[PDB]
Amino acid sequence: QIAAHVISEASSKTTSVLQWAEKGYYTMSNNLVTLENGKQLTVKRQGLYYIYAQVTFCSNPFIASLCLKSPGRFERILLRAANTPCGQQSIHLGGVFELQPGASVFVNVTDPSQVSHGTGFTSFGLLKL
Amino acid sequence: QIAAHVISEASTSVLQWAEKGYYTMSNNLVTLENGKQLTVKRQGLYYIYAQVTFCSNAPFIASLCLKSPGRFERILLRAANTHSSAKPCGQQSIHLGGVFELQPGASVFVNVTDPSQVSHGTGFTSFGLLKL
Amino acid sequence: QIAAHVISEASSKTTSVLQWAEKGYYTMSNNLVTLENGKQLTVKRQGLYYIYAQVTFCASSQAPFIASLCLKSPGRFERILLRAANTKPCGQQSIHLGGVFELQPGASVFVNVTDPSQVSHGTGFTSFGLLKL
């Protein structure tokens, strides 16, 4: 069975792209999915994947985005959710998408500083169907 | 494995969907009828989901509905948003999901109170299911 | 495949715990999940479940409306897994709680609220379910 579940970490850099860590409660033994550069999940096998994120952030429009990338292919949106305590809320994204070997999915946000990083807060993962 | 993911269509309180872009229609055991209804072919257990985004500019209500063959339609799920009021447009995403048992020929679709407020920009609004 | 979907029923402002029924278009896939005492979803088998609920709602202050997903586990005290807290008439709003959790044999989950009187019970507005992964 092919699945990764990965957890948020403060990005350090500039971008809208969230940075993730292999801090999960499961061991992706397989390698059929990998976390590259703490930014993206890259799969090795072609398939129908259920892909998800949860993004927890502080308020005071906020948009999370699940995107798809591949060598030779500009980034492309798969999913987007908008939202309008410390104002704290959650965006959840999830869907089925067909993925090819080498493909990567990643998450990006309008404001990375607003987001809450701990385990239990912001995650991102998938599982092959 | 039987699964569908369908994309919002540039448009009628019942939302339209397109088989275009990064959509998925695993097989002929699921299909999109009239660009409006996901109709399954086999009986079983389905996670069904929907995301509606809208200018939160009475509450906006999105509903998931079921047309079983031989039976009048019923509501499956509904979500309400009270939108004060809430900026220039004030985009909001509303999601509906559940585990439902479906009959051959069963079709689900998604209803909304104000079709003019829904966002069609890429990724914002989508509909699918998968067999469990 | 182990899954549940239950429907809201009205309840007294005497408990904070919400009430559910196997009525209308519900799911109780097999004997390994049940709805106990109109109130808790109880699993016979251990493992990884995705648990979701959606509650729709409308005072002496402007204290938020708050919904809590609770876990009761054999020989354990109850604990809170998730809280959603929200800041007319009436101002109909849906709030969602959900996530994935490792449940022990005979674990029970339920939903707490602030004002059960204000929760909407019209068809499809308030719901509770789970799915073993």
Ligand SMILES: O=C(NCc1cccc(-c2ccccc2)c1)c1cc(-c2cc(C(=O)N[C@@H](C(=O)O)C3CCCCC3)nc(C(=O)N3CCC[C@@H]3Cn3cccc3)c2)cc(C(=O)N2CCC[C@@H]2CN2CCCC2)n1
């Ligand atoms: O948030 C989810 N959606 C976003 C969402 C939420 C709410 C609403 C919506 C929405 C979208 C559109 C419209 C409306 C609403 C979206 C979500 C999360 C997870 C999930 C999360 C995690 C994860 O928190 N994990 C851990 C970690 O690692 O720290 C745990 C944290 C604490 C407990 C133990 C570790 N773990 C797993 C999981 O199963 N994992 C983890 C990695 C491998 C292992 C499985 N495994 C074990 C042995 C071998 C393999 C799965 C799975 C799934 C998932 O599938 N759903 C979601 C429900 C149905 C579907 C079930 N199906 C069946 C096959 C595919 C889809 N949706």
Ligand SMILES: *[C@@H]1O[C@H](CO)[C@@H](O)[C@H](O)[C@H]1NC(C)=O
């Ligand atoms: C969609 O259809 C239902 C059932 O046919 C109807 O009662 C309702 O008014 C509609 N739901 C919404 C949210 O507009």
Ligand SMILES: *[C@@H]1O[C@H](CO)[C@@H](O)[C@H](O)[C@H]1NC(C)=O
């Ligand atoms: C809900 O959860 C527990 C019951 O065990 C309790 O700590 C909390 O006070 C409850 N919430 C409300 C609003 O009563």
Ligand SMILES: *[C@H]1O[C@H](CO)[C@@H](O)[C@H](O)[C@H]1NC(C)=O
């Ligand atoms: C991040 O990704 C897309 C793809 O390039 C970009 O268009 C968008 O502006 C960014 N996402 C958000 C949520 O701003």
